[PDB]
mmCIF file of C-alpha atoms and ligand atoms in Angstrom:
data_model
loop_
_atom_site.group_PDB
_atom_site.id
_atom_site.type_symbol
_atom_site.label_atom_id
_atom_site.label_comp_id
_atom_site.label_asym_id
_atom_site.label_seq_id
_atom_site.Cartn_x
_atom_site.Cartn_y
_atom_site.Cartn_z
ATOM 1 C CA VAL A 1 12.894 10.532 -9.793
ATOM 2 C CA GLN A 2 9.176 11.163 -9.441
ATOM 3 C CA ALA A 3 6.642 9.187 -7.673
ATOM 4 C CA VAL A 4 3.072 9.547 -6.655
ATOM 5 C CA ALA A 5 0.311 7.945 -4.374
ATOM 6 C CA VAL A 6 -3.441 8.359 -4.785
ATOM 7 C CA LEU A 7 -5.357 7.926 -1.640
ATOM 8 C CA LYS A 8 -8.342 6.441 -1.416
ATOM 9 C CA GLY A 9 -10.511 4.732 1.188
ATOM 10 C CA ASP A 10 -14.403 4.319 2.003
ATOM 11 C CA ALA A 11 -14.737 7.261 4.399
ATOM 12 C CA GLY A 12 -14.868 10.137 2.162
ATOM 13 C CA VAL A 13 -11.455 11.378 2.373
ATOM 14 C CA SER A 14 -9.109 11.082 -0.842
ATOM 15 C CA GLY A 15 -6.269 13.058 -2.331
ATOM 16 C CA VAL A 16 -2.903 12.873 -4.359
ATOM 17 C CA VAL A 17 0.473 13.210 -2.973
ATOM 18 C CA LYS A 18 3.673 13.550 -5.196
ATOM 19 C CA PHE A 19 7.260 13.308 -4.385
ATOM 20 C CA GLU A 20 10.233 14.465 -6.738
ATOM 21 C CA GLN A 21 14.042 13.938 -5.682
ATOM 22 C CA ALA A 22 16.650 14.994 -8.334
ATOM 23 C CA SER A 23 19.234 12.676 -6.908
ATOM 24 C CA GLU A 24 20.479 11.128 -3.798
ATOM 25 C CA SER A 25 21.670 13.749 -1.459
ATOM 26 C CA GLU A 26 18.875 16.092 -2.452
ATOM 27 C CA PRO A 27 15.972 16.375 -0.165
ATOM 28 C CA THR A 28 12.677 15.152 -1.672
ATOM 29 C CA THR A 29 9.710 17.592 -2.244
ATOM 30 C CA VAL A 30 6.492 16.320 -0.895
ATOM 31 C CA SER A 31 3.313 18.027 -2.273
ATOM 32 C CA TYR A 32 -0.228 16.825 -1.427
ATOM 33 C CA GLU A 33 -3.778 17.871 -1.988
ATOM 34 C CA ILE A 34 -6.309 15.924 0.136
ATOM 35 C CA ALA A 35 -10.066 16.456 0.651
ATOM 36 C CA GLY A 36 -12.907 15.352 2.826
ATOM 37 C CA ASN A 37 -11.103 15.827 5.960
ATOM 38 C CA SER A 38 -12.663 17.387 8.827
ATOM 39 C CA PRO A 39 -12.476 21.359 8.474
ATOM 40 C CA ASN A 40 -9.909 23.646 10.256
ATOM 41 C CA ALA A 41 -8.225 20.520 11.828
ATOM 42 C CA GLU A 42 -4.883 18.686 12.048
ATOM 43 C CA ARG A 43 -4.277 15.203 11.026
ATOM 44 C CA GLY A 44 -1.367 12.871 11.049
ATOM 45 C CA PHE A 45 0.250 12.287 7.495
ATOM 46 C CA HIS A 46 2.863 9.289 7.498
ATOM 47 C CA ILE A 47 4.570 7.021 5.310
ATOM 48 C CA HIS A 48 4.059 3.483 6.582
ATOM 49 C CA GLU A 49 6.307 0.432 5.790
ATOM 50 C CA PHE A 50 4.279 -1.591 3.324
ATOM 51 C CA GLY A 51 2.567 -0.962 -0.142
ATOM 52 C CA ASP A 52 0.096 -3.929 0.509
ATOM 53 C CA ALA A 53 -3.370 -2.846 0.087
ATOM 54 C CA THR A 54 -5.058 -6.288 0.423
ATOM 55 C CA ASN A 55 -6.630 -5.401 3.930
ATOM 56 C CA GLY A 56 -7.817 -1.599 3.598
ATOM 57 C CA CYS A 57 -5.193 0.699 5.183
ATOM 58 C CA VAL A 58 -4.412 -1.944 7.797
ATOM 59 C CA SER A 59 -2.003 -3.927 5.891
ATOM 60 C CA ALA A 60 0.069 -0.749 5.370
ATOM 61 C CA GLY A 61 1.768 -1.727 8.648
ATOM 62 C CA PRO A 62 3.417 0.498 10.863
ATOM 63 C CA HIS A 63 5.416 3.554 10.038
ATOM 64 C CA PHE A 64 8.610 3.506 7.949
ATOM 65 C CA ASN A 65 11.366 3.273 10.495
ATOM 66 C CA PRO A 66 14.604 1.443 9.384
ATOM 67 C CA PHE A 67 16.500 3.169 12.018
ATOM 68 C CA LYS A 68 14.487 1.833 14.764
ATOM 69 C CA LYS A 69 13.818 5.263 16.389
ATOM 70 C CA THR A 70 10.377 6.442 18.239
ATOM 71 C CA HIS A 71 7.883 8.567 16.474
ATOM 72 C CA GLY A 72 8.226 12.011 16.438
ATOM 73 C CA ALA A 73 7.810 15.449 14.656
ATOM 74 C CA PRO A 74 9.319 15.874 11.206
ATOM 75 C CA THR A 75 11.917 18.586 12.556
ATOM 76 C CA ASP A 76 12.953 16.268 15.672
ATOM 77 C CA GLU A 77 16.216 14.499 15.550
ATOM 78 C CA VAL A 78 14.660 11.417 16.689
ATOM 79 C CA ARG A 79 11.808 10.476 14.513
ATOM 80 C CA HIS A 80 10.664 7.502 12.070
ATOM 81 C CA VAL A 81 11.716 8.325 8.532
ATOM 82 C CA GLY A 82 8.017 8.071 7.554
ATOM 83 C CA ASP A 83 6.844 10.781 10.099
ATOM 84 C CA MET A 84 5.527 13.887 8.194
ATOM 85 C CA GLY A 85 3.755 15.506 10.684
ATOM 86 C CA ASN A 86 0.122 17.024 10.773
ATOM 87 C CA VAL A 87 -1.371 18.569 7.661
ATOM 88 C CA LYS A 88 -3.733 21.215 8.386
ATOM 89 C CA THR A 89 -7.185 21.277 6.524
ATOM 90 C CA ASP A 90 -9.146 24.543 5.603
ATOM 91 C CA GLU A 91 -12.463 25.553 6.223
ATOM 92 C CA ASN A 92 -13.753 23.236 3.233
ATOM 93 C CA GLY A 93 -11.666 20.387 5.015
ATOM 94 C CA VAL A 94 -8.906 20.456 2.046
ATOM 95 C CA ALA A 95 -5.337 20.230 2.993
ATOM 96 C CA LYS A 96 -2.769 21.294 0.319
ATOM 97 C CA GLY A 97 0.668 22.289 0.556
ATOM 98 C CA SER A 98 4.037 20.953 -0.042
ATOM 99 C CA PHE A 99 7.611 20.570 2.098
ATOM 100 C CA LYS A 100 10.998 19.046 1.710
ATOM 101 C CA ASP A 101 12.551 16.449 3.798
ATOM 102 C CA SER A 102 16.010 15.160 4.018
ATOM 103 C CA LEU A 103 15.142 11.811 5.280
ATOM 104 C CA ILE A 104 12.486 10.592 3.096
ATOM 105 C CA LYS A 105 14.086 9.329 -0.311
ATOM 106 C CA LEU A 106 12.912 7.704 -3.538
ATOM 107 C CA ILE A 107 16.503 6.841 -4.291
ATOM 108 C CA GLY A 108 18.702 4.101 -2.499
ATOM 109 C CA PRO A 109 18.311 1.407 0.406
ATOM 110 C CA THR A 110 15.849 3.453 2.319
ATOM 111 C CA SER A 111 13.534 4.349 -0.703
ATOM 112 C CA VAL A 112 9.861 4.652 -0.042
ATOM 113 C CA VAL A 113 8.802 3.669 -3.687
ATOM 114 C CA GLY A 114 6.381 0.639 -3.099
ATOM 115 C CA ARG A 115 5.470 1.760 0.258
ATOM 116 C CA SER A 116 2.276 3.568 1.365
ATOM 117 C CA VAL A 117 1.154 7.016 2.497
ATOM 118 C CA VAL A 118 -1.816 7.259 5.019
ATOM 119 C CA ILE A 119 -3.559 10.204 6.232
ATOM 120 C CA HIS A 120 -5.119 9.681 9.607
ATOM 121 C CA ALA A 121 -8.561 10.801 10.948
ATOM 122 C CA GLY A 122 -6.835 12.332 14.289
ATOM 123 C CA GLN A 123 -4.181 14.697 15.150
ATOM 124 C CA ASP A 124 -0.602 13.565 15.565
ATOM 125 C CA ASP A 125 0.794 14.325 18.929
ATOM 126 C CA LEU A 126 4.250 14.394 17.400
ATOM 127 C CA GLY A 127 5.379 11.788 19.864
ATOM 128 C CA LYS A 128 4.598 14.195 22.845
ATOM 129 C CA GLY A 129 2.003 12.484 24.462
ATOM 130 C CA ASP A 130 2.419 10.244 27.693
ATOM 131 C CA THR A 131 1.435 6.932 26.392
ATOM 132 C CA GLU A 132 3.639 4.064 24.669
ATOM 133 C CA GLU A 133 1.139 4.932 21.672
ATOM 134 C CA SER A 134 2.575 8.361 21.724
ATOM 135 C CA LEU A 135 5.906 7.099 20.935
ATOM 136 C CA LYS A 136 4.695 4.657 18.044
ATOM 137 C CA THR A 137 2.065 6.287 16.169
ATOM 138 C CA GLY A 138 1.501 9.883 17.632
ATOM 139 C CA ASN A 139 -1.772 8.534 18.785
ATOM 140 C CA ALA A 140 -3.295 9.941 15.273
ATOM 141 C CA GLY A 141 -6.173 7.199 15.285
ATOM 142 C CA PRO A 142 -7.843 5.617 12.306
ATOM 143 C CA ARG A 143 -6.939 5.533 8.807
ATOM 144 C CA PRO A 144 -9.503 6.900 6.403
ATOM 145 C CA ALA A 145 -7.335 6.701 3.471
ATOM 146 C CA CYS A 146 -3.963 5.453 1.923
ATOM 147 C CA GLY A 147 -2.338 4.861 -1.245
ATOM 148 C CA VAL A 148 0.835 2.965 -2.430
ATOM 149 C CA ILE A 149 3.637 5.012 -3.708
ATOM 150 C CA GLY A 150 4.595 4.314 -7.413
ATOM 151 C CA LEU A 151 6.904 5.766 -10.077
ATOM 152 C CA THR A 152 5.589 8.284 -12.483
ATOM 153 C CA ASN A 153 7.530 10.543 -15.274
ATOM 154 C CA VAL B 1 11.584 -9.948 -1.062
ATOM 155 C CA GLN B 2 7.834 -10.043 -1.569
ATOM 156 C CA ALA B 3 5.588 -7.624 -3.338
ATOM 157 C CA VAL B 4 1.666 -7.503 -3.820
ATOM 158 C CA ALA B 5 -0.635 -5.569 -6.243
ATOM 159 C CA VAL B 6 -4.381 -5.317 -5.746
ATOM 160 C CA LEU B 7 -6.227 -4.795 -9.027
ATOM 161 C CA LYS B 8 -9.318 -2.611 -8.942
ATOM 162 C CA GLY B 9 -11.377 -0.803 -11.636
ATOM 163 C CA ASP B 10 -14.869 0.208 -12.267
ATOM 164 C CA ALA B 11 -15.663 -2.692 -14.664
ATOM 165 C CA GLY B 12 -16.252 -5.509 -12.299
ATOM 166 C CA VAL B 13 -12.982 -6.930 -12.700
ATOM 167 C CA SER B 14 -10.665 -7.241 -9.525
ATOM 168 C CA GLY B 15 -7.791 -9.459 -8.049
ATOM 169 C CA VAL B 16 -4.562 -9.892 -6.171
ATOM 170 C CA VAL B 17 -1.048 -10.636 -7.730
ATOM 171 C CA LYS B 18 1.628 -11.738 -5.248
ATOM 172 C CA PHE B 19 5.411 -11.794 -6.404
ATOM 173 C CA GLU B 20 8.254 -13.375 -4.394
ATOM 174 C CA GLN B 21 11.935 -13.425 -5.293
ATOM 175 C CA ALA B 22 14.358 -14.813 -2.761
ATOM 176 C CA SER B 23 17.470 -13.324 -4.211
ATOM 177 C CA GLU B 24 18.755 -11.545 -7.513
ATOM 178 C CA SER B 25 19.425 -14.489 -9.700
ATOM 179 C CA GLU B 26 16.463 -16.501 -8.598
ATOM 180 C CA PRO B 27 13.427 -16.032 -10.814
ATOM 181 C CA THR B 28 10.453 -14.407 -9.568
ATOM 182 C CA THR B 29 7.252 -16.472 -8.812
ATOM 183 C CA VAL B 30 4.037 -14.542 -9.728
ATOM 184 C CA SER B 31 0.687 -15.801 -8.545
ATOM 185 C CA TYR B 32 -2.555 -14.391 -9.274
ATOM 186 C CA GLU B 33 -6.413 -14.788 -8.557
ATOM 187 C CA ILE B 34 -8.400 -12.466 -10.393
ATOM 188 C CA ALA B 35 -12.317 -12.484 -11.000
ATOM 189 C CA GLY B 36 -14.976 -10.807 -12.711
ATOM 190 C CA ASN B 37 -13.562 -11.738 -16.159
ATOM 191 C CA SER B 38 -15.219 -12.977 -19.310
ATOM 192 C CA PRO B 39 -15.703 -16.754 -18.660
ATOM 193 C CA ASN B 40 -13.663 -19.500 -20.711
ATOM 194 C CA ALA B 41 -11.287 -16.684 -22.367
ATOM 195 C CA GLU B 42 -7.816 -15.524 -22.643
ATOM 196 C CA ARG B 43 -6.886 -12.221 -21.180
ATOM 197 C CA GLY B 44 -3.443 -9.990 -21.557
ATOM 198 C CA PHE B 45 -1.712 -9.850 -18.425
ATOM 199 C CA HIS B 46 1.279 -7.124 -18.296
ATOM 200 C CA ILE B 47 3.393 -5.153 -16.222
ATOM 201 C CA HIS B 48 3.346 -1.590 -17.221
ATOM 202 C CA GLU B 49 6.225 0.889 -16.814
ATOM 203 C CA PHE B 50 4.603 3.307 -14.007
ATOM 204 C CA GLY B 51 2.876 2.766 -10.692
ATOM 205 C CA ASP B 52 0.769 6.123 -11.205
ATOM 206 C CA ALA B 53 -3.012 5.818 -10.700
ATOM 207 C CA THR B 54 -4.188 9.351 -11.013
ATOM 208 C CA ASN B 55 -6.100 8.426 -14.454
ATOM 209 C CA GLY B 56 -7.452 5.037 -14.032
ATOM 210 C CA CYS B 57 -5.260 2.424 -15.679
ATOM 211 C CA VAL B 58 -4.320 4.869 -18.529
ATOM 212 C CA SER B 59 -1.495 6.598 -16.410
ATOM 213 C CA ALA B 60 0.181 3.348 -15.999
ATOM 214 C CA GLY B 61 1.553 3.937 -19.662
ATOM 215 C CA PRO B 62 2.982 1.267 -21.937
ATOM 216 C CA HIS B 63 4.605 -2.201 -21.197
ATOM 217 C CA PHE B 64 7.645 -2.093 -18.739
ATOM 218 C CA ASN B 65 10.524 -2.379 -21.388
ATOM 219 C CA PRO B 66 13.916 -1.135 -20.177
ATOM 220 C CA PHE B 67 15.518 -3.151 -22.932
ATOM 221 C CA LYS B 68 13.311 -1.581 -25.976
ATOM 222 C CA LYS B 69 12.392 -4.716 -27.583
ATOM 223 C CA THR B 70 9.133 -5.358 -29.267
ATOM 224 C CA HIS B 71 6.160 -7.192 -27.443
ATOM 225 C CA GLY B 72 5.973 -10.973 -27.278
ATOM 226 C CA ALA B 73 4.831 -13.944 -25.435
ATOM 227 C CA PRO B 74 6.643 -14.987 -21.935
ATOM 228 C CA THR B 75 8.645 -17.493 -23.715
ATOM 229 C CA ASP B 76 10.033 -15.436 -26.703
ATOM 230 C CA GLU B 77 13.596 -14.234 -26.645
ATOM 231 C CA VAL B 78 12.153 -11.093 -27.709
ATOM 232 C CA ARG B 79 9.713 -9.647 -25.479
ATOM 233 C CA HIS B 80 9.004 -6.754 -23.004
ATOM 234 C CA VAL B 81 10.288 -7.539 -19.505
ATOM 235 C CA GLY B 82 6.476 -7.056 -18.637
ATOM 236 C CA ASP B 83 4.895 -9.346 -21.092
ATOM 237 C CA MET B 84 3.066 -12.193 -18.912
ATOM 238 C CA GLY B 85 1.202 -13.559 -21.806
ATOM 239 C CA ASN B 86 -2.492 -14.322 -21.396
ATOM 240 C CA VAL B 87 -4.186 -15.696 -17.951
ATOM 241 C CA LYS B 88 -6.975 -18.232 -18.836
ATOM 242 C CA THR B 89 -10.311 -17.884 -17.146
ATOM 243 C CA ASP B 90 -12.794 -20.525 -16.047
ATOM 244 C CA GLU B 91 -16.305 -20.898 -16.391
ATOM 245 C CA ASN B 92 -16.793 -18.535 -13.651
ATOM 246 C CA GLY B 93 -14.575 -15.852 -15.286
ATOM 247 C CA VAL B 94 -12.096 -16.379 -12.523
ATOM 248 C CA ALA B 95 -8.237 -16.678 -13.642
ATOM 249 C CA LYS B 96 -6.051 -18.083 -10.942
ATOM 250 C CA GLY B 97 -2.508 -19.608 -10.977
ATOM 251 C CA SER B 98 1.166 -19.006 -10.718
ATOM 252 C CA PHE B 99 4.284 -19.222 -13.064
ATOM 253 C CA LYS B 100 8.237 -18.215 -12.640
ATOM 254 C CA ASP B 101 9.827 -15.690 -14.760
ATOM 255 C CA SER B 102 13.312 -15.018 -15.080
ATOM 256 C CA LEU B 103 13.168 -11.385 -16.791
ATOM 257 C CA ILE B 104 10.482 -10.113 -13.969
ATOM 258 C CA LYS B 105 12.429 -8.871 -10.878
ATOM 259 C CA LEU B 106 11.937 -7.308 -7.605
ATOM 260 C CA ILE B 107 15.470 -6.612 -6.921
ATOM 261 C CA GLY B 108 18.023 -4.327 -9.040
ATOM 262 C CA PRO B 109 17.826 -1.720 -11.402
ATOM 263 C CA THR B 110 14.912 -3.449 -13.433
ATOM 264 C CA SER B 111 12.703 -3.854 -10.329
ATOM 265 C CA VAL B 112 9.155 -3.865 -10.992
ATOM 266 C CA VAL B 113 8.329 -2.414 -7.413
ATOM 267 C CA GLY B 114 6.553 0.944 -7.893
ATOM 268 C CA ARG B 115 5.196 0.063 -11.317
ATOM 269 C CA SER B 116 1.736 -1.457 -12.246
ATOM 270 C CA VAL B 117 0.041 -4.726 -13.155
ATOM 271 C CA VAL B 118 -2.681 -4.304 -15.721
ATOM 272 C CA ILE B 119 -5.268 -7.225 -16.604
ATOM 273 C CA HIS B 120 -6.657 -6.534 -20.070
ATOM 274 C CA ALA B 121 -10.307 -6.817 -21.684
ATOM 275 C CA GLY B 122 -9.322 -8.812 -24.665
ATOM 276 C CA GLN B 123 -6.824 -11.515 -25.808
ATOM 277 C CA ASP B 124 -2.646 -10.744 -26.159
ATOM 278 C CA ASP B 125 -1.893 -11.889 -29.487
ATOM 279 C CA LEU B 126 1.499 -12.298 -28.287
ATOM 280 C CA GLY B 127 3.026 -10.076 -31.061
ATOM 281 C CA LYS B 128 1.915 -12.548 -33.607
ATOM 282 C CA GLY B 129 -0.494 -10.179 -35.447
ATOM 283 C CA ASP B 130 -0.021 -8.087 -38.244
ATOM 284 C CA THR B 131 -0.271 -4.623 -37.113
ATOM 285 C CA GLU B 132 2.101 -2.176 -35.617
ATOM 286 C CA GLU B 133 -0.104 -2.454 -32.342
ATOM 287 C CA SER B 134 0.543 -6.052 -32.367
ATOM 288 C CA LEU B 135 4.198 -5.209 -31.566
ATOM 289 C CA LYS B 136 3.336 -2.644 -28.931
ATOM 290 C CA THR B 137 0.509 -4.172 -26.833
ATOM 291 C CA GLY B 138 -0.455 -7.458 -28.223
ATOM 292 C CA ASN B 139 -3.710 -5.663 -29.469
ATOM 293 C CA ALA B 140 -4.814 -6.799 -25.909
ATOM 294 C CA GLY B 141 -7.631 -3.980 -25.759
ATOM 295 C CA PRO B 142 -8.858 -1.924 -22.659
ATOM 296 C CA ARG B 143 -7.753 -2.112 -19.192
ATOM 297 C CA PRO B 144 -10.438 -3.108 -16.809
ATOM 298 C CA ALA B 145 -8.315 -3.026 -13.695
ATOM 299 C CA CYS B 146 -4.768 -2.442 -12.604
ATOM 300 C CA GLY B 147 -2.838 -2.116 -9.179
ATOM 301 C CA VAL B 148 0.753 -0.368 -8.183
ATOM 302 C CA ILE B 149 3.181 -3.272 -6.965
ATOM 303 C CA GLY B 150 4.017 -2.290 -3.610
ATOM 304 C CA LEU B 151 6.346 -4.205 -1.050
ATOM 305 C CA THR B 152 4.988 -6.368 1.619
ATOM 306 C CA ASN B 153 6.500 -8.912 4.250
HETATM 307 CU CU1 CU C 1 0.626 6.634 11.129
HETATM 308 CU CU1 CU C 2 -0.828 -4.478 -21.992
HETATM 309 ZN ZN1 ZN C 3 5.960 7.720 13.410
HETATM 310 ZN ZN1 ZN C 4 4.590 -6.023 -24.155
#
């Protein structure tokens, strides 16, 4: 199965994130190219629960977390399914890369098809900060762009 | 389950379409409000196969048609699952309404979550025209706006 989200917003950031998962047990490969960010920085990149764009990136809701865990890094055992950590931007403000993840899936009961991807304006502290906020969003700040994840071929 | 698609494009048409389906056998209720159309007209309103917005409304692909039928009216026995007929616009160019449909579903193998809704710039001839085109798209013309269908609460 393949899916894609086109990230848009009014803050100058935009980009495309592609997902591919051959079958249920295979991990999903996530590839992204996002431009217009601050340069040489780290920015929070998450999958949020709803694919509702009626109110900017606000209506995407909180991070996708069917197992009711606290926020963390992609490699922590305790994390939200939606937590993809930070993406690093180059000197031109572009973040480009790909990685594989075993919790995010396009098939089955926790599929993220129909949900949203959000790129934040701040760095995700990976749930290592000292507020209740760190344990919810990573204190990643505003949401300059987001897009609903749709099926593609 | 509830889902929503926010229709956007560069041609002045925009709108929101909400879907709700309580369970598998229940029909789905579709409610829409779309503005910026020509006034007092009929315009094709369909669900297309892919939720891919990387190329305008072009990458939405053709109508959603898992059963490989030809295009038709919502009430014909032979139609695409995606065929919702025409919506009528008022003197201000607004189309607003709701209806129930038993082929479109948000649950199960033919779910339309992750696919797209498209409002066209022309009238859908309901597969009653005389071209091979009528049997594919209803000869509904260009696609001024579209949106991916995402989950909501
Ligand atoms: Cu977030
Ligand atoms: Cu169409
Ligand atoms: Zn999180
Ligand atoms: Zn059709």
